[PDB]
Swiss-Prot record, chains A, B, C, D, E:
It comes from Oryctolagus cuniculus (Rabbit). Its main location: cytoplasm. InterPro entries: Actin (IPR004000), Actin/actin-like_CS (IPR020902), Actin_CS (IPR004001), ATPase_NBD (IPR043129). It catalyses: ATP + H2O = ADP + phosphate + H(+). Actins are highly conserved proteins that are involved in various types of cell motility and are ubiquitously expressed in all eukaryotic cells. This is Actin, alpha skeletal muscle. Its EC number is 3.6.4.-.
């Protein structure tokens, strides 16, 4: 802390929560965010008569308690129950009071106005923040790696982004709030397993099936060929183990799951497509300036990690876009941390002290002000 | 038969088997499907030294022989032993060879892939089907009553469906394979009887307790009030008789049994709820097109018959769904026969001859093909 | 005999012996089985210096020689001395060698294992049986009258049975080896006579008092009333004559003697009761299947003949068992012959030739084998 | 007693009664529970003209008086006559009035509702309990040994349990009220002795044959091999002595008796099987959480003591359950006392004072309330 | 007498009569019971012209008057003539009127019903008994010596008993009315004397020969050896004197006479045997309870006194009965008085006043009532 407090940073992405102090490599503490209640009554009293919350222990005990995601698609529907997640985050992982160290809140772009004003009140009023700013998901990634120019994609468990940013300026013509996420992607996985005869349907049950994809999955550069080849032989079949109960085998569904990200045709919505999506945003920008963006494409966030993301993405973007154009995915191994890390850099980079807002100003001004001055 | 054979239809639901010829009102022969063996040895020889199978006679003699359901949750685990059920159905009830008259097989949606390919081989190879198609449970109901547009629910002894179908098209976003059934519902009944001091636990024993619910049961429009009122007085108590052994009385447990269908909270799983379930499927459809579905809701199948199913279902759907919306259950007195009857209409409706598959094509193509072209 | 020998059948019940050839109405020769020695020495030599055995002549000469029952409660304690009974039976009544014509042995169920294995050796080794099978008392009755389904009671001079048999199968949950018999019943008679001032105590003496009951006795539908009414007047008193010595009169003890069969309370053991006993066996059967047994109750054997057995048995079974249930005693006038006759039917009913066992197989296998394959 | 009374605990299992004060090692007084009347009249008057009850002295004098078990399968059919057992227990063994020291009642789970409400009235009204709670058999075991997590089996003389409990919570999906017990197991023993030629049939007679098994019996890890080996030689035969009358020898039936517990196939019911039974309960639990239960299996109660219970149980559970899974029986030498001891811990563990119920509350509320708040 | 009369007790065994007042050591007056008439006419008149009766004087004058035993085997055949015996007993030995002091009648168990009802009338009507009870021979012995538990044998001049009694209760399964007595035993003596050339045959003649056995006799532990040894030498021969007429010598027949009691093989009836008899009664009792009876065997009555009764009885009971069992004869030197003395104790032991019956009750009720309430 010293004479002047460090900059506390909190990710609050959608399902995964990242927290910590001023610009520091890797977040101080990471844990999934859930806060449900136990399914039914237990005979014992006073030994286990206490609620399981905020992942971690609650996360470990999946079977007894149903887990609920407080926020969907980067939108907080739960609100009040969610606040405890921050409550747990501040005391424990950080073990610091909200009023002392300034914290950077992170909010997904193009979401209801209410979420940002109300979020401020919860943190600002209940926690009397010493200094705070509602951050934008896509911008922070740029601060980290990828220099200061390019297009960033941060598909997550609830929300995905594709915002074009040139130099110190970013054009708002094609932000692209696609209704896709690793979470719902997981659901598709649950439905397809029926193919293998496995059935999963519950909050904890979903948790177990979730990650299976992380461990097992291929983007497949030529997709079409993959189904015809994988179906032909075991090759990519391999195996995985399901906790105690059984041993599951991820047939050729192992590579088809990732495609919905690329073309929701399988899921059922033709609204967007990753190779088709990244392209539209870049087109709705100055025709003269796109070269800097084509070669500055950087993928950071969830699903980005997915095995071979850059590979399929790379070939497709080239197909639709004109030749003689240099296109790169600049996908870093440290990706997925852009939101917290990049944000941390901005927070404790001094000379940027004025942008942060605190007590007094907000009290004299309407909740609209906190939302104002943000972009 | 004539110059060209009629269309033989076979339900093969899960526990109840329906069979017959081309689109004919009501199925030709109905009987429960079981095929277990006698519990122990009998001294007599040659007079009773023959196995009791395929319900009917086997069904009548419940005490001496344990009955097993060859398929659970619309999933065939037994496979080979089950085939005799069809064997008995073909010779006796229909008394027609499998090679001559074309038959429509019925299969529950979102089940293991293996069931459909393997089922084909058994019927296709062992019976050399002249023509056949693996049907879908939910679709056939629409063909019968309810016009050509709406949402159908066919809760059965093993599997339940809630698939939204608009016009000649159906959206696959929320089929809903709930893990509920009249059968397991029966088990709950067996456990609650302990309340009255009655104990039942065996295949035949379950059979007797099974149907008791059919004879005695109320959905209860306001449930909460029912326990408080029914417990207060005898009113709904009435009575029932148990074969020779005693006379049982279905206390206030008479109306509580049906609720688990509505809210498995009592059974112990919070995954689904009828009023909550039907709603989710409709929501996961085009926001603009839902009105046709709200007013075209039709319930056909087991448990649907349950006294007052439409009543409780009706009021609850209206509560969660927005006002000014017209919702109906279009529950027909002939329901439960949609699978066979509706199917029969499709089978012998001509101009649909090409969809049916037969010998030669399958032999030249992999078992995958029979599974293919189906949806 | 012809090219292939007929089926010789031997009852060997407990005190009464029945023998004969293949399924023939009524047994070839009947006589009580005893084989004791003369009480003391006679002066004459060579004219009467020969032992009196195997009833008949020995039976006629009761005073000079004490008679012993080789088997008690269907259990052979004497063993070796008993074999002569068969010896006499084979040569004389049947006048056929044991090695030629195949014979069916009869054994009481739930008795020591030794009796059946040892019995085989005596007949199998000493007599080299051409073919034989150790039969079960209760089963044979079913073959005769009573169809193929029901419960049979064969109370005898040593052993009684109550085995429930459904169709070609019989459940072993409640065979019921009650420790009751007409013989010991006789003893009760001897003790009660003291009431009338008559004293009997010896093997021959017991023989005379035995049968008296057969000639004089009433089951009494309302028992309680009988003692109060019979004591009031002579009515049922009537009379009987005792060979030469005196003329006895069977007071009201005439109807009380049969009750001990129904309730050994008088004899002194509360273990079983006929009305209470038949009921327990049926209850320990499938709850669903009991109706066939209630209406198929058939009494065959000793004491069954007793005057009015069906009458008292009839009303009582109805009292404890639930109403609306049809119960019958199906007591045939030819009863008591079920063991031999029914058995004879099974023996010479062909197509049942494989079950019979003979020389060679037993020699190569242990005595346990003869016991095995039996049930 | 002091200023505040200690916690009196009463087992009331089914045949064996345990009683005592607040959480104390081993129960204060143990004795079997029976309360029958003498078989017949004795000439002497005023010296022995007094009834023999509540085991102990009554138990010692088995021949003269028939003993009846007031409760079967954890179900009280006798009710009123049974109350004296508690009457004897309170005065004598404890020698304390029911109104002063609070007592914990023990009731078998999944039994008629009436037993728990009526039991309360008898103790609550007739004894005006200062404080009481109707306990659950399975839960208490957990409190003692086995930590706070696992699956417990407490097979007894009338009722058996297999309830899965995780942490301070227990799932009710598979409690498993198997219709098995040490008592009925004894009956099987009585029927098989006929093999050795020994006959037993009466309340006292049963008592003598009962315990014989305790003294002589083997679970047999490979069963099949045991019959083939034991029959081959005397080895396991050994010997036992029957009071005065004779000396019995427990042939190879010594190890077969325990199997019916494992597979009632011998008894005649295929409803359950120990290795098959423990498995089903664990399966009907969260798929993710079962590891804690597999390694936390603890057997406490009757028949559990049976020689080698853990051995056979151990290998079989491992066979059907998937590999790589750690399974233990955590069978303690002090087992069988879990019901009383574990219960005593809960009773006198303070901070659990509110759960106990007393006078006033029950009087103002219906008997349903005492049943309510229990689980 | 005082304000309330003492309890008069009358043995009336069979040949010997015992009489007296309330529980007093040793009977007040003892004398054999006979009442015959003089053989022929005497010339003298008025000096000896009076009948000789009721033993004593009549007994002294054996030659002139033939003596008749009014009762045989504990059965009164004479009836009317016998009453004078009581007539003489009441006036003379007791010198008290029958109406004043209450008296206890003694009756042998398992005798004709008539003897007990008719006996009541004679005493009750002719004597108007102030209070009376028909006692049982065997029970009274227990009251005296031998505690309250055991088996008693009271072989007498006409009747013998072997009734097992446990605690205040006695089981009726094997009372054992053996047809043996010291009297008939005497006859055997008369016949064997022919061996020595002595002839005796008349009522008085029998009296003289009777007692000779009392004075001279050995039970002989090894019997067989005794004939072989005694015949070898004079040893046991010794001598006796016959009144005036001659001096007889009891050769080796001295020890053989007692054996018939043990085995009537010599007399001619194989019905019973002392060592074999005591054993059967104990066996026909609860198998579990026999130990108390084996060690509580007590012999009281006639022939019991016989020299060495306990010796032979002791070794033999041990031979047939299983080892490790403690058996005793608890034969008291005061035995033979159990019937009167033991009875007297019961009579004047107060609190047992209700059992006694008197005038009024019997008059209003049938003679059957006096017989009723007795056991
Ligand atoms: N290495 C990985 N492989 C596959 N999927 C991943 C991987 N890492 C994260 N994910 C998925 O990314 C989603 C969350 O992404 P992310 O954007 O990083 O979190 P947040 O939005 O909370 O900041 C989840 O559905 C998760 O399963
Ligand atoms: N009229 C009825 N009332 C209550 N339950 C019924 C009724 N008819 C059928 N059921 C229940 O419905 C289930 C089988 O339903 P169904 O779907 O019609 O058969 P299937 O799946 O074999 O085609 C059973 O559990 C049965 O008990
Ligand atoms: N007609 C009858 N009336 C009374 N008792 C009879 C009659 N017939 C046979 N009994 C009795 O039945 C007993 C023998 O019965 P049974 O079973 O027929 O013979 P077994 O066991 O030798 O085959 C005897 O005690 C006999 O006295
Ligand atoms: N050590 C033992 N060996 C074999 N059986 C035993 C042993 N201990 C108890 N049993 C049996 O367990 C049964 C009673 O068990 P338990 O559950 O402990 O009593 P309760 O149900 O009354 O609490 C009886 O059938 C008894 O014979
Ligand atoms: N001391 C004795 N020695 C041998 N025999 C005796 C003795 N005392 C009595 N007896 C015989 O016992 C018989 C009468 O026995 P008891 O039972 O005592 O008399 P009661 O039946 O009249 O009561 C007579 O035959 C008598 O001779
Ligand atoms: Mg993110
Ligand atoms: Mg169906
Ligand atoms: Mg018979
Ligand atoms: Mg217990
Ligand atoms: Mg006497």
């Amino acid at each position: 802390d010293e004479d002047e407090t460090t900059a506390l940073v909190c990710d609050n992405g959608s399902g995964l929560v990242k927290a910590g102090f001023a610009g520091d490599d890797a977040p101080r503490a990471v844990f999934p965010s859930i806060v449900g209640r136990p399914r039914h009554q237990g005979v014992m009293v006073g030994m286990g008569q206490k609620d399981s919350y905020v992942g971690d222990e609650a996360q470990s005990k999946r079977g007894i308690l149903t887990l609920k995601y407080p926020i969907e698609h980067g939108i907080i529907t739960n609100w009040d129950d969610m606040e405890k997640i921050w409550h747990h985050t501040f005391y424990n992982e950080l073990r610091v009071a909200p009023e002392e160290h300034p914290t950077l809140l992170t909010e997904a772009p193009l979401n209801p106005k209410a979420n940002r004003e109300k979020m401020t009140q919860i943190m600002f009023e209940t926690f009397n923040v010493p200094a705070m700013y509602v951050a934008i998901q896509a911008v922070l990634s740029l601060y980290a790696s990828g220099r200061t120019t390019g297009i960033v994609l941060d598909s997550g468990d609830g929300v995905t982004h594709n915002v074009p940013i040139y130099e110190g300026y970013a054009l708002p013509h094609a932000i692209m709030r696609l209704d896709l996420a690793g979470r719902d992607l997981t659901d598709y996985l649950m439905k397809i397993l029926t193919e293998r005869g496995y059935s999963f349907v519950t909050t904890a049950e979903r948790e177990i099936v979730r990650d299976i994809k992380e461990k097992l999955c291929y983007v497949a550069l030529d997709f079409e060929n993959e189904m015809a080849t994988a179906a032909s032989s075991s090759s990519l079949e391999k195996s995985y183990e399901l906790p105690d109960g059984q041993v599951i085998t991820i047939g050729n569904e192992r590579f088809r799951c990732p495609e919905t990200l690329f073309q929701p045709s399988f899921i059922g919505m033709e609204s967007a497509g990753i190779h088709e999506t990244t392209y539209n945003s870049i087109m709705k920008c100055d025709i003269d300036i796109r070269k800097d963006l084509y070669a500055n494409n950087v993928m950071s966030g969830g699903t980005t990690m997915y095995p071979g993301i850059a590979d399929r993405m790379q070939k497709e973007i080239t197909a639709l876009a004109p030749s003689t154009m240099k296109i790169k995915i600049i996908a870093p191994p440290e990706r997925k941390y852009s939101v917290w890390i990049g944000g941390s850099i901005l927070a404790s980079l001094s000379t940027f002290q004025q942008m942060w807002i605190t007590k007094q100003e907000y009290d004299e001004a309407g909740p609209s002000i906190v939302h104002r001055k943000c972009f």
